[PDB]
Design a protein around this nucleic acid. Sequence first.
RNA 1: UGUCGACGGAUAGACACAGCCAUCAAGGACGAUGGUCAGGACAUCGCAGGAAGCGAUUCAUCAGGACGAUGA
Lengths: 59, 59, 59, 59, 59, 59
Amino acid sequence: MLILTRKVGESINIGDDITITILGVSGQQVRIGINAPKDVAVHREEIYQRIQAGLTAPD
Amino acid sequence: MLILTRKVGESINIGDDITITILGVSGQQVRIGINAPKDVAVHREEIYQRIQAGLTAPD
Amino acid sequence: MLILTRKVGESINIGDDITITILGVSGQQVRIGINAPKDVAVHREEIYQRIQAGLTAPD
Amino acid sequence: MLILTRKVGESINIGDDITITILGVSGQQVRIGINAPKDVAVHREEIYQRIQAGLTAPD
Amino acid sequence: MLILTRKVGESINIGDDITITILGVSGQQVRIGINAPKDVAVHREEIYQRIQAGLTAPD
Amino acid sequence: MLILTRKVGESINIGDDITITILGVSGQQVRIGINAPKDVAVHREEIYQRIQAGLTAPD
RNA sequence: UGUCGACGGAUAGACACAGCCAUCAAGGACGAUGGUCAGGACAUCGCAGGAAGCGAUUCAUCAGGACGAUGA
């Protein structure tokens, strides 16, 4: 794990194809944009389990 | 862009190899954890630009 | 309708028997005291309309 | 004294002829709408104290 | 002169009209409540220098 | 009722004779210095009650 | 402003609704006029009743594969 601390409106990067943007907060909620090719998946942890258990949305 | 919201301490996933956790907020800052293999790089956008600047003789 | 602009610690008078005091202010909310006799009823609007919904007749 | 903590834009009632609305605050000033018949006299205490000196609104 | 040590949520007093309350700490920062009549002034040492040198009313 | 946020080593003032200094912190404990004239009293809230409620001289 | 939904690829959506302060007004009008965050407030927000009633609060810097460190 690599942990950072960034403000709202800032940006982060993964690999050479993936970008992340912290769009803002709403109380304890944190609104996060992800930007990746459809060659890779992105979901909430509660959702990720469905695409990995029975692959409910392949694409 | 795929936007997801998370409450503090909740999690997100990317691909089949990467996990993300929003650890918490402090003011307008957000402590964010990134868990990926060293097979991929991770950087904030202000550092990412250096990996796009070109580099030699790694660690 | 008669509009007035009353500052913290000042008072309005109604009829010959009712008086109103702005005891103070707390941002977007206001702390108002009513000085009417128990011969007349005083209630919030969301508590006046519950009275006048019909519940005053005997069992 | 009957006391209420009222937000701006909420309302209050007295007897069966009078209604009050807290139109808003302007700093430590408080804009109040008073909605009684002209059958009742309705002024700030400053004014009321002359009217009860033995008169009505002067020439 | 009086030196004393008090923990968060405890109280201290001056004269017959002044109260001090430690609301709590944040690292080296210490949030303090001060309760005195408008008969007396209160500011931090930075601002106090005005009340000594330039005052709140000219000649 | 004023509220301030002072850090260790800094000062606050009351009236035109009284000075307060935050001497430092130890966990929850907060060490404080008070400088007032002989014309006034100063104690912690525990001891203050002896000067308010029971007094240091009888009738 | 907080909360929720949303396998959604959208700088997205849904639900419940978020600045501060002075001057004039016997005025019946949701009146008029001007300024603007180290203050006189536990900064705002919630509950309720004939009582001048009641409960509860942080921000920022550095930075690497570490649920990172630190300052105010």
